[PDB]
Design a protein around this ligand. Sequence first.
Ligand code: IGI
Ligand code: MG
Ligand code: ZN
Length: 313
Amino acid sequence: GLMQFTLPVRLCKEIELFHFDIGPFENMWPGIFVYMVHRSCGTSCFELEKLCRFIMSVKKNYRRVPYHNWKHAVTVAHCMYAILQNNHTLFTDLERKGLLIACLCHDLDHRGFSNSYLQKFDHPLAALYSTSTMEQHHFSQTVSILQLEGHNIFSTLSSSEYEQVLEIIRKAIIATDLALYFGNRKQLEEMYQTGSLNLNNQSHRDRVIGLMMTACDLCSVTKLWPVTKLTANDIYAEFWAEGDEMKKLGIQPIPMMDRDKKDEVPQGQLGFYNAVAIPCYTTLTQILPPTEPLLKACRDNLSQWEKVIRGEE
Ligand SMILES: Cc1ncc(C)n2nc(CCc3nc(C4CCCC4)cn3C)nc12
Ligand SMILES: [Mg+2]
Ligand SMILES: [Zn+2]
């Protein structure tokens, strides 16, 4: 109760910034997450023993894949921490509790394959969940772990508060399905620009949290260039393995997943920043002005990919 997590000075200062990298010391990531829960939510939000036990079960249920791993989960939660800390008064007590947990859980038991590969392989999960296949799986795994004995971190919430927090987590995790992002941001764009956006409207909050989830999920493009560049290798290493698996089913993969088209990566990154990243952080910055450093960082990394194409690196 009088037991705070503290971090070394460089981490204590840099963890508050959007571009913070959680580092290569896996054993410090749980501590980092608890630190962020404590400052973002309070030392009273969760029973430390339950929270620690929940964090270690979540870690255990992330797999050793190149990108969609326990490091990604903690990275996505740290970006959410930075958004929440820079927008103190916009979020409910329940939202603050649920969104860091949603972020830590959002890719639980990912196998390194897209929804599309599960459907073409005819994976059991593709019969159980027809759309947002992996994301319904991630939420299902979150509920499983919350129901392990001694793992119910929400035990002190009322029956209806409990139902609301699980409903925030569910919508937040579903929103990390990038297929849903394009329409969600188009609607948020229209609402902001016609002045109809209203944060007392629960369906509007839902959309805004969906956009925050895309922002945190893609936050590799908002890091220092060397972090962005080395993360992009992990991202493509999964896509190229999926491409190999597509070729095994007798299907030419899309170029994104074809390791034979490595040379075109710099141009694929431009399309991605222009079609997905920049629009995401732009609308986010319009809705939550203090999130501007994410947009600014993303624009800097777009300019670094432009330099790569111009053979200036
Ligand atoms: C940086 C980043 N973060 C998150 C996600 C989901 N992605 N997806 C990507 C792929 C971006 C792309 N490359 C290509 C290929 C390049 C070689 C042939 C074409 C196509 N396209 C869309 N980059 C990211
Ligand atoms: Mg995902
Ligand atoms: Zn993710």
